[PDB]
Amino acid sequence: MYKIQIFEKGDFNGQMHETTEDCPSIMEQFHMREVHSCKVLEGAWIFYELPNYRGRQYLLDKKEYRKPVDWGAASPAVQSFRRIVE
């Protein structure tokens, strides 16, 4: 499993990026400073505020997230993410 789409803007607008693997730094990889919305097409993920899986964490397991408040965040600051492997 594991498939996720991240967007530059809220409600699924803007530049989109689809990935199936962990990302230690969204800026290095996708060249985005913030994540305004996303869709977890398959799997469960952990969103992190800072690169290298650090800072504040958010759980992304639902199908769609239109705005950052939907994953429990007060801002669109997300700089790394990874699949929850059990």
From Swiss-Prot:
Keywords: Acetylation, Eye lens protein, Repeat. GO terms for molecular function: structural constituent of eye lens. Coiled coil: none annotated. One of its GO terms (biological process) is visual perception. Residues 2-42, 43-85 form the Beta/gamma crystallin 'Greek key' domain. It comes from the Eukaryota. Has a two-domain beta-structure, folded into four very similar Greek key motifs. Belongs to the beta/gamma-crystallin family. Crystallins are the dominant structural components of the vertebrate eye lens. Monomer. This is Gamma-crystallin S. The gene is CRYGS. The chain holds residues 94 to 178 of 178 of the full protein.
